[PDB]
PDB file of C-alpha atoms and ligand atoms in Angstrom:
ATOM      1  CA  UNK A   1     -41.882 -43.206 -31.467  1.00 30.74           C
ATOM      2  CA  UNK A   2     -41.977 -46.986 -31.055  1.00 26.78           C
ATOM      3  CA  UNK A   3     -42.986 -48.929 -33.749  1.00 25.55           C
ATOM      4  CA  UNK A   4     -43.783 -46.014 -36.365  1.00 24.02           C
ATOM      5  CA  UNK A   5     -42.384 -44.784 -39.231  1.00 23.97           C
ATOM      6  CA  UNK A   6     -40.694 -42.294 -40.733  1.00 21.39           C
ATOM      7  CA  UNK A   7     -42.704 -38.882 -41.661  1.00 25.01           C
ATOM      8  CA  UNK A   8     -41.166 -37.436 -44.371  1.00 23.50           C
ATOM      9  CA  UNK A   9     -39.302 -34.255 -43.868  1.00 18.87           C
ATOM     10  CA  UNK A  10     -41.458 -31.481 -43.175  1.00 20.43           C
ATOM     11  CA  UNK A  11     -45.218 -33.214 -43.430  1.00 20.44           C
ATOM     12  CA  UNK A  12     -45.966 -32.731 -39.827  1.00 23.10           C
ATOM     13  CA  UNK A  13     -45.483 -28.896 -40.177  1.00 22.60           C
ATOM     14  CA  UNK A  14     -46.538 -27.986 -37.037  1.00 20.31           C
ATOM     15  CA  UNK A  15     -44.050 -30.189 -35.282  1.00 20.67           C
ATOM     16  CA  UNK A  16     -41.624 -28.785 -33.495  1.00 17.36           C
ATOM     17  CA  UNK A  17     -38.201 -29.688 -31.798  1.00 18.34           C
ATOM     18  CA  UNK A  18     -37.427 -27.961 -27.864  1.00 15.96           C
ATOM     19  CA  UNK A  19     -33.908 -27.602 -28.049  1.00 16.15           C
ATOM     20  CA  UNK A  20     -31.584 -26.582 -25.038  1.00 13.67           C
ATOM     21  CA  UNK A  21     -28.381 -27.652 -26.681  1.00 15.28           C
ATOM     22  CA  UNK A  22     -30.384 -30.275 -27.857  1.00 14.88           C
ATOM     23  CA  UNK A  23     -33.271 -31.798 -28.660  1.00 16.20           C
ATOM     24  CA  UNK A  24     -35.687 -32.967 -25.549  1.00 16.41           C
ATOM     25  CA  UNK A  25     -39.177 -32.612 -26.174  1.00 17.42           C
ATOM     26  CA  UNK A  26     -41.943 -32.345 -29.045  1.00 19.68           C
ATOM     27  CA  UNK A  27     -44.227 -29.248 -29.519  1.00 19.17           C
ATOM     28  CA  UNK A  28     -46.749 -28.431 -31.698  1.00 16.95           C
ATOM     29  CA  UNK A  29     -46.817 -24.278 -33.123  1.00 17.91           C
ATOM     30  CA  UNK A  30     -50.620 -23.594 -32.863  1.00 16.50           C
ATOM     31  CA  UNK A  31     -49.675 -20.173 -34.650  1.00 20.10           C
ATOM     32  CA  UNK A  32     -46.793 -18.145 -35.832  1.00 20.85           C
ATOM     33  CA  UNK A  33     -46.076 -17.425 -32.431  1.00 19.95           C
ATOM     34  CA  UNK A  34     -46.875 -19.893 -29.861  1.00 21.90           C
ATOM     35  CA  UNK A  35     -46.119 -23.909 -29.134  1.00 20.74           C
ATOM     36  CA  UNK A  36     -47.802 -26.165 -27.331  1.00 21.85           C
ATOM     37  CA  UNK A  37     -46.001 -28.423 -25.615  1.00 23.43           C
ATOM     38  CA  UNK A  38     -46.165 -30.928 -21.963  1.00 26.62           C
ATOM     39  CA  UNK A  39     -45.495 -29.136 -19.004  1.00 22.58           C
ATOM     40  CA  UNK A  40     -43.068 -31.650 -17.806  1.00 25.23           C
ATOM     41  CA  UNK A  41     -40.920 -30.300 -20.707  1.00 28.35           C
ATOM     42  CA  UNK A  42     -40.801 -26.523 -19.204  1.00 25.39           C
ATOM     43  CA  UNK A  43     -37.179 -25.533 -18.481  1.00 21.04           C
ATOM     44  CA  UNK A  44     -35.899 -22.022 -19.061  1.00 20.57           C
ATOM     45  CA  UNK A  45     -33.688 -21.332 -22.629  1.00 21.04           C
ATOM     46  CA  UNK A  46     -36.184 -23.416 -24.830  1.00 19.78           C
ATOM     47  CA  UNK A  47     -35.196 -22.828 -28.502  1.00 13.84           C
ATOM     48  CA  UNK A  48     -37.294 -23.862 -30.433  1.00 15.71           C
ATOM     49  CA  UNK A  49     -36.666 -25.668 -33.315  1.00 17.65           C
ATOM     50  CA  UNK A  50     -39.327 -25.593 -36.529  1.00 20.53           C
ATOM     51  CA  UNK A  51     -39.349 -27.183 -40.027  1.00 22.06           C
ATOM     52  CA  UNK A  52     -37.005 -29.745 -39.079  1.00 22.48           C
ATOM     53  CA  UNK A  53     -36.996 -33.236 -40.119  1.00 24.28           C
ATOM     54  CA  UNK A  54     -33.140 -34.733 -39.146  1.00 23.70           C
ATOM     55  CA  UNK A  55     -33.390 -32.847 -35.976  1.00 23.55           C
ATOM     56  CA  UNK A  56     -29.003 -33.254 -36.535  1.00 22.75           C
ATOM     57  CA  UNK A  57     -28.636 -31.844 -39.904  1.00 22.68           C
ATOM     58  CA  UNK A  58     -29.314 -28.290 -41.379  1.00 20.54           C
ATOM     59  CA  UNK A  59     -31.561 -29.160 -44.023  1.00 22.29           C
ATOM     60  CA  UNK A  60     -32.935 -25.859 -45.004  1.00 24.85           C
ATOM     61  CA  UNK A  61     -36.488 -25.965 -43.883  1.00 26.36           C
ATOM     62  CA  UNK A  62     -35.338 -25.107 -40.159  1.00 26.44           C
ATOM     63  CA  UNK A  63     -36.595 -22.001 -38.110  1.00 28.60           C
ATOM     64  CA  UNK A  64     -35.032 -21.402 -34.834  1.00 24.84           C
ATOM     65  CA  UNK A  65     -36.506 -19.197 -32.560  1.00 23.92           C
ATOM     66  CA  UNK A  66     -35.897 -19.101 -28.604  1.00 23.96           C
ATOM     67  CA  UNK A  67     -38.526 -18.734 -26.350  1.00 26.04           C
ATOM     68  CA  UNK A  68     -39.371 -15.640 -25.060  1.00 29.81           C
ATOM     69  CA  UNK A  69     -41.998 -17.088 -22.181  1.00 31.67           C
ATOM     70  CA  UNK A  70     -42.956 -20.417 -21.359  1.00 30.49           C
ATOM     71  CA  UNK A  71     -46.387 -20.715 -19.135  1.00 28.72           C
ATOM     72  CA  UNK A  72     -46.954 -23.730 -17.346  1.00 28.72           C
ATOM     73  CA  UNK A  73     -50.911 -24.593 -16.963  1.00 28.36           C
ATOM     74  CA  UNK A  74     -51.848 -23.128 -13.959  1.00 31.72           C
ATOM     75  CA  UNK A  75     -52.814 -26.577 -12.478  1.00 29.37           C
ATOM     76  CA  UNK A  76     -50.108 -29.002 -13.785  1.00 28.26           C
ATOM     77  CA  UNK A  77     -49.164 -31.110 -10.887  1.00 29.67           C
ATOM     78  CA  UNK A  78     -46.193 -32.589 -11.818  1.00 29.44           C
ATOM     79  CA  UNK A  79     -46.446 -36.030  -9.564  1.00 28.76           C
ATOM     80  CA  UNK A  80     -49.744 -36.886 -11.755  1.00 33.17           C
ATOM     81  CA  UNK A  81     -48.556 -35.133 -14.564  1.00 30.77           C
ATOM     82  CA  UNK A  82     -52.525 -33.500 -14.371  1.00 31.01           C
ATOM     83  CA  UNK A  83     -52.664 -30.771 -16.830  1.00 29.15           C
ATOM     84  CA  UNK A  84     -49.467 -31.682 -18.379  1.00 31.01           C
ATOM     85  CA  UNK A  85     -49.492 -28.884 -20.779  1.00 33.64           C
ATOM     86  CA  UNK A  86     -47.338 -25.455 -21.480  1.00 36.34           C
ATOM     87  CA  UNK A  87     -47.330 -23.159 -23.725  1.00 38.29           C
ATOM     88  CA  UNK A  88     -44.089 -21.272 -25.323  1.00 37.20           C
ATOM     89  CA  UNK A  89     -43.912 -18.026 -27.106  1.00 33.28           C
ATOM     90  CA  UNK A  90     -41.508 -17.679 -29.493  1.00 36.66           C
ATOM     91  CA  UNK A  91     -39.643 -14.514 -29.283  1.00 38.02           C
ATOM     92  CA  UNK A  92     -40.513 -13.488 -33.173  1.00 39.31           C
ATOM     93  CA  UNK A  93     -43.049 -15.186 -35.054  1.00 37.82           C
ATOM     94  CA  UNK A  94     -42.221 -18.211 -37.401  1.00 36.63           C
ATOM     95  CA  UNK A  95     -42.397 -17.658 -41.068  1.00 34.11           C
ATOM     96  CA  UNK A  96     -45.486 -19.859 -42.113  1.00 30.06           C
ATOM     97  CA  UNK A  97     -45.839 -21.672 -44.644  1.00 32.57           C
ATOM     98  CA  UNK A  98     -46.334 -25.117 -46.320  1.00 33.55           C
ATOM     99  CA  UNK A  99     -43.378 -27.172 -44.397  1.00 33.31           C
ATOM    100  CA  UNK A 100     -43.944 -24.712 -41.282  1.00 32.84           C
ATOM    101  CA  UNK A 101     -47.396 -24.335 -40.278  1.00 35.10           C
ATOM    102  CA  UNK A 102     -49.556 -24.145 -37.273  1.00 35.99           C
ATOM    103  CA  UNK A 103     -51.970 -26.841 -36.351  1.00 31.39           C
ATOM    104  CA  UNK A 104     -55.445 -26.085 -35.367  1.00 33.36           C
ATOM    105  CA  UNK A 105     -57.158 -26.400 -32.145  1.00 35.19           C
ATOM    106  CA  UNK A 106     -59.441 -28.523 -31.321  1.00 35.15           C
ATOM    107  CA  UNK A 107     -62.968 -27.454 -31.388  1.00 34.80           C
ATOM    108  CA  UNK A 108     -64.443 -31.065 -29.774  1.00 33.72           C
ATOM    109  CA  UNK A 109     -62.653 -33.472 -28.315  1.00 36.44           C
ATOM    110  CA  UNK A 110     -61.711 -36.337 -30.289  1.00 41.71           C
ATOM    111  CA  UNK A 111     -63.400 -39.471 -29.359  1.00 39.75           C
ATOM    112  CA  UNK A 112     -62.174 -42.882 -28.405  1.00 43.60           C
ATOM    113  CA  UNK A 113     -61.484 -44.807 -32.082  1.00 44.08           C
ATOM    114  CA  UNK A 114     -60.681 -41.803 -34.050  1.00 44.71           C
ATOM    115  CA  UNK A 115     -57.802 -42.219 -35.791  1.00 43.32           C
ATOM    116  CA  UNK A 116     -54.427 -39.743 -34.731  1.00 43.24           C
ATOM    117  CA  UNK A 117     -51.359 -39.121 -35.729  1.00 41.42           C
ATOM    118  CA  UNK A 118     -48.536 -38.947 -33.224  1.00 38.89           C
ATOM    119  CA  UNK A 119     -44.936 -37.413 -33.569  1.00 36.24           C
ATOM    120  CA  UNK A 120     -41.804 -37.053 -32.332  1.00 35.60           C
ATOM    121  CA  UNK A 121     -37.579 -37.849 -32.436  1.00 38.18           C
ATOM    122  CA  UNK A 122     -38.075 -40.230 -29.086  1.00 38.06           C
ATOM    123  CA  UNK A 123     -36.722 -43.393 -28.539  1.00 39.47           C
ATOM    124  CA  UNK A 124     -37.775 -46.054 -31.252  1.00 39.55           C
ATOM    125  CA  UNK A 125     -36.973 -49.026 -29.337  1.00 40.00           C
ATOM    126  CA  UNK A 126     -39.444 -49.861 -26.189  1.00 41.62           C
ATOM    127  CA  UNK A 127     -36.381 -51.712 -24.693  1.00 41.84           C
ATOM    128  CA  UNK A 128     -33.264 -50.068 -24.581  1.00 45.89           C
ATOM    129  CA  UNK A 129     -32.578 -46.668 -26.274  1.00 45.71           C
ATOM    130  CA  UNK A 130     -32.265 -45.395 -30.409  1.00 49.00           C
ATOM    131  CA  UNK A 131     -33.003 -41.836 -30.871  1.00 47.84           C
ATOM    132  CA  UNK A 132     -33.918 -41.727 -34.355  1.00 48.87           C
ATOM    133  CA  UNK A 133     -32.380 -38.847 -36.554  1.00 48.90           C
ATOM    134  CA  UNK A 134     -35.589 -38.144 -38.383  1.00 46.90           C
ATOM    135  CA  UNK A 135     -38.712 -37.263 -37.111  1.00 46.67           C
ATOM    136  CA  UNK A 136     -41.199 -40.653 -36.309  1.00 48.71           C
ATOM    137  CA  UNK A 137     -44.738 -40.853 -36.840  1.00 51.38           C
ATOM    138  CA  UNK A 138     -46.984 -43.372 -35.642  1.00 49.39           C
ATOM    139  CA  UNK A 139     -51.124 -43.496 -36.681  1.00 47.74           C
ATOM    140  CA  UNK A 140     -52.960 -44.590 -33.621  1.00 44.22           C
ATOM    141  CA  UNK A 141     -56.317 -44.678 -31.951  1.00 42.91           C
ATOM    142  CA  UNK A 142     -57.596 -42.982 -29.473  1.00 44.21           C
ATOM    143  CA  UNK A 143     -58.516 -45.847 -26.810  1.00 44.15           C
ATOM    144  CA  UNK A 144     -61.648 -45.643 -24.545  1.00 46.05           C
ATOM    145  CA  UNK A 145     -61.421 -43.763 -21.480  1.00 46.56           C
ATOM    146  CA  UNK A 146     -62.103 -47.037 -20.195  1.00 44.82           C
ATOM    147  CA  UNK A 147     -59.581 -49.060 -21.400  1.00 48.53           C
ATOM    148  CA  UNK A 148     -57.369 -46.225 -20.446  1.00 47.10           C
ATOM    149  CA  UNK A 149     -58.315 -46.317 -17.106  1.00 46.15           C
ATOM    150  CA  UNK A 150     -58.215 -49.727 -17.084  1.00 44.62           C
ATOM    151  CA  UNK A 151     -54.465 -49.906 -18.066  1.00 43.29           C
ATOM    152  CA  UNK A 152     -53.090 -47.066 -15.666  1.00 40.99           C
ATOM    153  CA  UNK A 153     -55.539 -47.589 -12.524  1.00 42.28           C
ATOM    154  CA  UNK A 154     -56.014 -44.691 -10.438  1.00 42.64           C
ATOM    155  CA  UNK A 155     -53.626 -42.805 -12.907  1.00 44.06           C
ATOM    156  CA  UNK A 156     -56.251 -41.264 -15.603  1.00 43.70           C
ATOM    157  CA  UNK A 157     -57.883 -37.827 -15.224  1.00 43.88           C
ATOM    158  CA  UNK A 158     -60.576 -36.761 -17.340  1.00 44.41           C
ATOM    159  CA  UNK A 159     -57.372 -34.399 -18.996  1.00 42.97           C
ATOM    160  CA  UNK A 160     -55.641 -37.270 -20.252  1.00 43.50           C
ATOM    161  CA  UNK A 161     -56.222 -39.867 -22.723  1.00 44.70           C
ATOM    162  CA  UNK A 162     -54.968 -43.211 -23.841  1.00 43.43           C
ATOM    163  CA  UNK A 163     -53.488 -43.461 -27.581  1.00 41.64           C
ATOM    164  CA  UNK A 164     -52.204 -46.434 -29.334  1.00 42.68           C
ATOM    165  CA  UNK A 165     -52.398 -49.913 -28.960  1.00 41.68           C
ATOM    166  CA  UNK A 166     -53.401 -52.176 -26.088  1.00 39.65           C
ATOM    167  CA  UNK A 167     -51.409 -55.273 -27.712  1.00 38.27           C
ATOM    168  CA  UNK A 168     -47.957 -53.230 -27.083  1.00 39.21           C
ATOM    169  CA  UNK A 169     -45.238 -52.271 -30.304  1.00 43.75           C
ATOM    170  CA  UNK A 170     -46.138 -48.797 -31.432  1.00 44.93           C
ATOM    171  CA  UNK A 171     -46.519 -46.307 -28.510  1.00 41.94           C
ATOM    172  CA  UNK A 172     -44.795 -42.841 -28.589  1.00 40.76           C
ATOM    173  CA  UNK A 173     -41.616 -42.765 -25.993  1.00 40.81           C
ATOM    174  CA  UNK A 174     -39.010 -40.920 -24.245  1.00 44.02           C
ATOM    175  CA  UNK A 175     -38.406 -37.388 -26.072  1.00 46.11           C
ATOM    176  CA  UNK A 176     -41.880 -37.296 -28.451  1.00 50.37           C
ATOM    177  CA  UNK A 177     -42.835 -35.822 -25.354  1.00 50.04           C
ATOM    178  CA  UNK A 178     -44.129 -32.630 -25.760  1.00 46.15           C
ATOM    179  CA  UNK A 179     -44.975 -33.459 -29.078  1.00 49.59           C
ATOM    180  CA  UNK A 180     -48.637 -34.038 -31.012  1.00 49.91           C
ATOM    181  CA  UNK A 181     -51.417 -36.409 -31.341  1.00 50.47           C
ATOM    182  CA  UNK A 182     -52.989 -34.407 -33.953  1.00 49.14           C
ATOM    183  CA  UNK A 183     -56.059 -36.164 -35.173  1.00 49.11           C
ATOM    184  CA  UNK A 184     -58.927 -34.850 -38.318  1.00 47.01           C
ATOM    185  CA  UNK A 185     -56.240 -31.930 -38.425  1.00 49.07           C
ATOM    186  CA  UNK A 186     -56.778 -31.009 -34.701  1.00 49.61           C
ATOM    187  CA  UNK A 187     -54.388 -30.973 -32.069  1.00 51.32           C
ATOM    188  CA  UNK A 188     -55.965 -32.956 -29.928  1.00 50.76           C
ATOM    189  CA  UNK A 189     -53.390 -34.389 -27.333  1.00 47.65           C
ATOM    190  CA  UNK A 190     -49.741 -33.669 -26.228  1.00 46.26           C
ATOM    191  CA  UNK A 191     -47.429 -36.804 -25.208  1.00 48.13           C
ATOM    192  CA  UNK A 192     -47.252 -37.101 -22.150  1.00 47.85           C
ATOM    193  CA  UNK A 193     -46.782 -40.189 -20.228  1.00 47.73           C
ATOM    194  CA  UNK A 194     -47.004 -44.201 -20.001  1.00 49.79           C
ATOM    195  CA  UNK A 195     -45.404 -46.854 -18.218  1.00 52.47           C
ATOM    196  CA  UNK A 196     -42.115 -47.305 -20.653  1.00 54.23           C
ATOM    197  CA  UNK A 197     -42.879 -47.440 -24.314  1.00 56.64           C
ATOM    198  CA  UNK A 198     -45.038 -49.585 -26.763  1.00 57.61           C
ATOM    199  CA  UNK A 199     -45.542 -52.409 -23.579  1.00 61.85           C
ATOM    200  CA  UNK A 200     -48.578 -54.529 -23.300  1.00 61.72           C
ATOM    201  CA  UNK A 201     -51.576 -52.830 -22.290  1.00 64.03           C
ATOM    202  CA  UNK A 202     -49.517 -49.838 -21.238  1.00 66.12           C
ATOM    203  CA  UNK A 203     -50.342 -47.279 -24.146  1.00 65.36           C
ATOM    204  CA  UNK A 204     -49.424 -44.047 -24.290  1.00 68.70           C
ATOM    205  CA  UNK A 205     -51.245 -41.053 -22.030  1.00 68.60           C
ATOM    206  CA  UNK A 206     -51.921 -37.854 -23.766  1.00 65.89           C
ATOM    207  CA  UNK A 207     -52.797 -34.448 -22.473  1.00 66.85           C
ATOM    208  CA  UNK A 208     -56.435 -33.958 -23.738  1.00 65.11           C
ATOM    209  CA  UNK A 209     -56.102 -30.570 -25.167  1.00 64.66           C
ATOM    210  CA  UNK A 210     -59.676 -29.853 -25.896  1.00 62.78           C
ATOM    211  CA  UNK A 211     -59.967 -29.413 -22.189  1.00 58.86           C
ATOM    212  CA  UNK A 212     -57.469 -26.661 -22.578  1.00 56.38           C
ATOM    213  CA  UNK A 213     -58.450 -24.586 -25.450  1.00 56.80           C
ATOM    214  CA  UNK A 214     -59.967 -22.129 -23.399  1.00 58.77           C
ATOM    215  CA  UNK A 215     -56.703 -21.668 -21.473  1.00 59.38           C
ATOM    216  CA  UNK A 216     -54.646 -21.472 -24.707  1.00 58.63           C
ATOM    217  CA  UNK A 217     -57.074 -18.566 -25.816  1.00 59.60           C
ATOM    218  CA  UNK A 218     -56.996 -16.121 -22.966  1.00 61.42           C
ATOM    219  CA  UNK A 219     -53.604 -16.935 -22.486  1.00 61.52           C
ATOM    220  CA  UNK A 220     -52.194 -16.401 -25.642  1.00 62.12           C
ATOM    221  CA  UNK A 221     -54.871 -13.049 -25.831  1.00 63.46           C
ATOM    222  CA  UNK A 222     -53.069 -11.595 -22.917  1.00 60.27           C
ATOM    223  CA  UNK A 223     -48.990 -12.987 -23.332  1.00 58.94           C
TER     224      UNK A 223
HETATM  225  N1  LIG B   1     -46.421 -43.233 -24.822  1.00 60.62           N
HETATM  226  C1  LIG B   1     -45.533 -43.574 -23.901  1.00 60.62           C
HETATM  227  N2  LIG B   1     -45.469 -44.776 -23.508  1.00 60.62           N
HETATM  228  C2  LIG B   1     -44.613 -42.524 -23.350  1.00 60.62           C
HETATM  229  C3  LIG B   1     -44.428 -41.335 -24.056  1.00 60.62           C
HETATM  230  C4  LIG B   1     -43.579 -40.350 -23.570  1.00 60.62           C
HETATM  231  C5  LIG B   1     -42.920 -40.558 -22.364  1.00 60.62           C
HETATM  232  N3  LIG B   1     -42.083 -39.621 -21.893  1.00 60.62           N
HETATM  233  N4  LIG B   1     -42.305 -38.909 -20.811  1.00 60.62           N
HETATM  234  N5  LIG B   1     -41.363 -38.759 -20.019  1.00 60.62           N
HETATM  235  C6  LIG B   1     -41.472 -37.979 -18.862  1.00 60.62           C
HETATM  236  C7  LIG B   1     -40.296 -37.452 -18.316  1.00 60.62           C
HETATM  237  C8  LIG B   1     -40.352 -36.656 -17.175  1.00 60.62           C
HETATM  238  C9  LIG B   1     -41.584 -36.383 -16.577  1.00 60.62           C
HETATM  239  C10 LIG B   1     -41.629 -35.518 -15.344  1.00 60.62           C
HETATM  240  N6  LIG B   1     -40.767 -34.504 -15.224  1.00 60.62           N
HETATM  241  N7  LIG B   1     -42.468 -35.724 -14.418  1.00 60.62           N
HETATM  242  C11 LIG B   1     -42.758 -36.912 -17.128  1.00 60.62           C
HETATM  243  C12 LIG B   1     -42.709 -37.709 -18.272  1.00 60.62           C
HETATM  244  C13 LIG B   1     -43.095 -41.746 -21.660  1.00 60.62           C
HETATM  245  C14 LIG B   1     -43.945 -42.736 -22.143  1.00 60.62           C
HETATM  246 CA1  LIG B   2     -32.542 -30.182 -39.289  1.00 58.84          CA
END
């Protein structure tokens, strides 16, 4: 996260860490057994990591849990990063409470203006690299479809949105992928993508996961 600040440990409870020897994308634990998360973060030996603020440090709020299945959405294509959405089942379920909890789905779609919050250890900097310790949280607005389109021509699909800020300096980055845009307490996107982090009129591209509840459902009724 470009240009945000720092959370507090353990008020985004439904963040999560993907660790494979270390951390390397966001998630979001939708309930005590499942995480939402980008497809372009799938790779096999996920553990994930819960109630952790310094993603380095045992601080005594942590779950681990390894993945027992990931499941890519059927459609993501990873060259447009369409449908850039998974979902991971933990191999027990996560103890929840206060500092670990899941975040709701999305019953609407959020629309363009609403306020969001977005999380994640990624990069801080937009140029050159400073993985922060502790997890980074940046409030941004969901930008018009428009504007979105507008600032990644030919690049939108109506299953991603634009988040953030059009003038450039706070943008999620590189490893808050994965991770939420959670906005009126609803999960409403995933980081996913955007041309380098926190640049002019390049803002960050979410996975709209209202388009995906349905999915999320059914899947998680039958894994
Ligand atoms: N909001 C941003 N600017 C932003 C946020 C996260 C981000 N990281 N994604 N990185 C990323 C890495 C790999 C893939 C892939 N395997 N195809 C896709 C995306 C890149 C940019
Ligand atoms: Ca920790």
């Amino acid at each position: 996260i470009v240009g945000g600040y720092t959370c507090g440990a353990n008020t985004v409870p439904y963040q999560v860490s993907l660790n494979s020897g270390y951390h390397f994308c966001g998630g979001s634990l939708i309930n005590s057994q499942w995480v939402v998360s980008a497809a372009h973060c799938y790779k096999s030996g996920i553990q994930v990591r819960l109630g952790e603020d310094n993603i380095n440090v045992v601080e005594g709020n942590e779950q681990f849990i390894s993945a027992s299945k990931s499941i890519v959405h059927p459609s993501y294509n990873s060259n447009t990063l369409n449908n850039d959405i998974m979902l991971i089942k933990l191999k027990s379920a996560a103890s929840l409470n206060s500092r670990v909890a899941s975040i709701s789905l999305p019953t609407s779609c959020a629309s363009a203006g609403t306020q969001c919050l977005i999380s994640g250890w990624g990069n801080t900097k937009s140029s050159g690299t400073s993985y922060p310790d502790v997890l980074k949280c940046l409030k941004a607005p969901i930008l018009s479809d428009s504007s979105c389109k507008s600032a990644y021509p030919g690049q939108i699909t109506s299953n991603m949105f634009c988040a953030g800020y059009l003038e450039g300096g706070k943008d999620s980055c590189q490893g808050d992928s994965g991770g939420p845009v959670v906005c009126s307490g609803k999960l409403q996107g995933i980081v996913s993508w955007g041309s380098g982090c926190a640049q002019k009129n390049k803002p960050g591209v979410y996975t709209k996961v209202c388009n995906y509840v349905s999915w999320i459902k059914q899947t998680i009724a039958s894994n």
